[PDB]
Design a protein around this ligand. Structure first.
Ligand SMILES: Nc1ncnc2c1ncn2[C@@H]1O[C@H](CSCC[C@H](N)C(=O)O)[C@@H](O)[C@H]1O
Ligand SMILES: [Zn+2]
Lengths: 52, 106, 328, 79, 175, 95, 51
């Protein structure tokens, strides 16, 4: 179930992948890396099998 | 050859002369009478229609409804002196409320 | 229970009032008349008001009906009023008297003085771009050149150290209301080249706000606006110098010499200054002459899922800080 | 027949609104109907005189204007 | 008497007319009265409150549209240079701010309503309407105008240019 | 709603802006038919003609009302009265 | 770029637009089983378009 009537798409992305995105945005806003894909992948693998 | 362009007016002059000749107002008329009448009718028609156009552009409507003519004739004072006992079909009346009949409170 | 709407309409007590004033001829923006990516350049120089990158808010103001923005805000997938790849000037830090095309190529000014700024900074790399002056009627100043966001968007180009200019008429260099007969004039059909010479990496100072209450978020009548505002008297006193501090006003390669030096240290926006009604075309980017080197200035106007995902990305981009901030 | 009651209360109320009044008494309608009837009969007398002098059993509109002009009023926009 | 220097030298005066005599319906279509029947009801004479003034030889009662104020409408950026030039040429604070974004300068262009004064006991209040899509300021009176008095409107400044009018309620300042 | 006298002003202004007729077509037509039958029988009316008479009536009638109006003002009151109608009819010089 | 004269959020919104946008879209909607090669190819596909 994704984005039919219950969870709006903006609300869906605001409530489904938060624990990775806040760190990613924080590191691209402070550590300012031209290539932040490694950080996002590392934080995705931390909860790769933990995704409900 | 035409005759209206001799004076530069717009209202017909031959028509006025024929209609006044067959109107039995008298038996014999001069030459300046038809042109003079055409001229005065021209002036009065222009006087009315300029205000008609002003009222037309007041409400931003291209077509001139008779309400505009009623307002233009009534609001002027010389017209109201000259058009004293005359009404207009579909004309309506200009807005007016008596002064002492105006309620107010704090 | 119906006084909340009147408070939201009069202006309330949340800093700036909720009654906008942008009385010059403001166009090219504010397309969707609802709660969507919007923008309001304000009369007051330094007021940037935007709605893209949306955010939720706390419901139940005065025990009325439950607002839809309690925990699950309504989505949005439609036109977004900005640009990503290479902003052709800008759509946020502008004056509400500039006429731009829908594709954002031509710039038409007001009856009085006007300018447009940009939203992209330059630190290293080649930015040899051009401003093709389509036409320049008499009594229409066409001074062009880089400037700073701190610059007053209605002040003459060069009036402050934030802004740098080269006069289109008689080539007389002007800055801080000081004029020296320096070069020859330009105008009709005269393409003004512009390549800010900092191919090497530099360092500058970006942000130092002095006010907070004017930076608030509240519903205007049916939509939110982000009061991201600059100040002046504090910003001018943080003025510093930086590397490659020279705003050169070229002539498409040929240069008469940089008119004024020691430019303000900060993010650079190429400001185009007009003085009366006049149009002008633009081409900016990390290229030399041809606009299509990167993505050719995408407008993000499509109905597919790409617009949906980009809008949700922007929503999250502002949602992170609207969650970690803590609303008063 | 009895049709003078045809001109009912709301219509005369609206025409009073035309006049420029808000406070009107409930015992004014009868004499207004009388005055209206007098005016109509006075006009239509001349109307039928005109229409029968021309030996036409119909009644046109231009003769109505003619009688209105002869009486003292004048009508514009009709013929 | 050509041998004693009298004081009060500096004047900074512009409208050199100061004398010691001073011997004094729907909305959109009312535009005519602005330009044609609006040049007799008011005379220009020496005000007693301060400087010059618009005295009266006619009478106008309550709720009557009188004058439209027009001047050099400019944006707020020109305010800095305008105030600098006011300090230079000796120009009063003619910064007629219809709003915080547009101000009606009256030092290079303006109308006959540049002659007004200020007092905490005025005769008229301001009002603004919109005709044909343009916002214009027209004043409607609340009382009757007597022959020989001066028009004045409250500036409504919430509480250093003094306001010397002599009225008992006069707060002696623009406040 | 409430506050009698307020709704009267709104109604009178709304109707002053409007410029339509005020009498239903069929009742007035039948009345003209009856008053004609009083004079002569079997008269065929022109649909334009009737309309004509109609308008003239209101004109006359409305003028009368206005006069009575100012007469009431001369009597230190707002409500108009029958006696004022005879006042206007006699003073006009049309009795 | 990306350090001082280009603000961090401004750098994200201006310079590297066509790379993180597509990667985030594919990892938020499509999520291929092996996205590492997709993101590597997308990163390498923009090399002479942005400075
Ligand atoms: N009584 C007063 N005393 C001092 N200043 C006044 C004043 N009344 C008005 N002003 C100021 O003068 C400015 C207008 S110039 C004054 C009008 C004109 N020069 C004259 O001779 O009368 C206004 O901005 C107002 O602030
Ligand atoms: Zn005083």
């Amino acid at each position: 179930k994704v984005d039919l009537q219950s969870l709006p798409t903006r609300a869906y992305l605001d409530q489904t992948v938060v624990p990775i995105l806040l760190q990613g945005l924080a590191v691209l806003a402070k550590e300012r890396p031209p290539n932040p894909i490694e950080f996002l992948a590392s934080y995705l693998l931390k909860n790769k099998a933990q995704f409900e | 050859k035409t005759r209206s362009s001799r004076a530069g007016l717009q209202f017909p002059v031959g028509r006025v002369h024929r209609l006044l000749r067959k109107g039995n107002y008298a038996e014999r008329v001069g030459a300046g009478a038809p042109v003079y009448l055409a001229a005065v009718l021209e002036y009065l028609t222009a006087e009315i229609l300029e205000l008609a156009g002003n009222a037309a552009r007041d409400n931003k409507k291209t077509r001139i409804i008779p309400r505009h003519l009623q307002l233009a004739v009534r609001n002027d004072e010389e017209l109201n002196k000259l058009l004293g006992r005359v009404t207009i079909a579909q004309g309506g009346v200009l807005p007016n409320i008596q002064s002492v009949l105006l309620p107010k409170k704090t | 229970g119906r006084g909340a709407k009147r408070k939201q309409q009069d202006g309330g007590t949340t800093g700036t009032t909720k009654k906008a004033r942008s009385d010059p001829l403001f166009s090219a923006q504010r397309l969707p008349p609802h709660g969507y990516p919007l923008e309001h350049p304000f009369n007051k120089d330094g007021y940037r008001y935007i709605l893209a990158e949306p955010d939720p808010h706390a419901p139940d103001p005065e025990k009325l009906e439950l607002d839809c923005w309690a925990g699950k805000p309504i989505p949005g997938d439609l036109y977004r009023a900005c640009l990503y790849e290479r902003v052709l000037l800008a759509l946020h830090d502008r004056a509400p008297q500039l006429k731009i095309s829908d594709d954002r190529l031509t710039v038409v000014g007001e009856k009085g003085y006007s300018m447009v700024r940009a939203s992209h900074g330059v630190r290293k790399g080649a930015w040899y771009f051009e401003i093709t002056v389509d036409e320049m009627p008499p009594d229409t100043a066409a001074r062009l050149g880089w400037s700073q966001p701190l610059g007053n968007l209605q002040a003459p180009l060069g009036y402050d150290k934030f802004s740098y200019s080269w006069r289109s008429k008689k080539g007389t260099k002007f800055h801080q209301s000081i004029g020296k007969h320096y070069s020859s004039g330009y105008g009709q059909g005269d393409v003004l080249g512009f390549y800010i010479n900092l191919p090497e990496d530099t360092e500058t100072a970006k942000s130092l706000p002095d006010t907070y209450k004017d930076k608030a978020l509240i519903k205007f009548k049916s939509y939110l606006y982000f009061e991201e505002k600059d100040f002046v008297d504090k910003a001018e006193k943080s003025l510093k110098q930086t590397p490659h501090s020279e705003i050169i006003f070229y002539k498409n390669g040929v240069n008469q010499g940089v008119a004024y030096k020691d430019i303000f240290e900060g993010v650079y926006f190429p400001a185009i200054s007009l003085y009366k009604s006049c149009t002008v075309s633009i081409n900016f980017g990390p290229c030399f002459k041809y606009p299509p080197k990167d993505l050719t200035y995408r407008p993000m106007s499509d109905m597919g899922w790409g617009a949906v995902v980009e809008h949700t990305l922007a929503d999250v981009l502002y949602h992170v800080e609207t969650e970690v901030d803590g609303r008063r | 027949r009895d049709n003078i009651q045809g001109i009912t209360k709301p219509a005369i109320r609206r025409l009073a609104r035309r006049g420029g009044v808000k406070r009107i008494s409930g015992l004014i309608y009868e004499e207004t109907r009388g005055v209206l009837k007098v005016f109509l009969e006075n006009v239509i007398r001349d109307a039928v005189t005109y229409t029968e002098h021309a030996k036409r059993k119909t009644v046109t509109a231009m003769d109505v204007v003619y009688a209105l002009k002869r009486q003292g009023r004048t009508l514009y926009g009709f013929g | 008497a050509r041998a004693e220097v009298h004081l009060r030298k500096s004047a900074f005066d512009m409208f050199n007319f100061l004398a010691s005599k001073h011997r004094q319906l729907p909305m959109p279509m009312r535009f005519r009265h602005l330009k044609k029947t609006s040049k007799e009801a008011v005379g220009v004479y020496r005000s007693p409150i301060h400087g010059r003034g618009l005295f009266c030889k006619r009478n106008i009662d309550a709720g009557e549209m009188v004058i439209e104020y027009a001047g050099n409408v400019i944006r707020s950026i020109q305010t800095d240079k305008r105030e600098k030039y006011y300090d230079s040429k000796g120009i009063g604070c003619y910064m007629f701010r219809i709003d915080d974004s547009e101000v009606v300068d009256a030092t290079m262009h303006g109308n006959a309503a540049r002659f007004i004064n200020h007092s905490c006991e005025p005769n008229c209040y301001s009002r603004v309407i919109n005709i044909d899509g343009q916002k214009h300021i027209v004043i409607f009176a609340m009382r009757k105008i007597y022959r020989g008095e001066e028009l004045t409107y409250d500036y409504k400044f919430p509480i250093k240019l003094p306001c010397n009018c002599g009225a008992k309620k006069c707060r002696k300042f623009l406040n | 709603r409430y506050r009698p006298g307020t709704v009267a002003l709104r109604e009178i202004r709304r109707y002053q802006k409007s410029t339509e007729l005020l009498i239903r077509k069929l009742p007035f037509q039948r009345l003209v038919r009856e008053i004609a039958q009083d004079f002569k029988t079997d008269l065929r009316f022109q649909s334009s003609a009737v309309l004509a008479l109609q308008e003239a009536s209101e004109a006359y009638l409305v003028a009368l009302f206005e006069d009575t109006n100012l007469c009431a003002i001369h009597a230190k009151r707002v409500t108009i009265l029958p006696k004022d109608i005879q006042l206007a009819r006699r003073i006009r010089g049309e009795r």
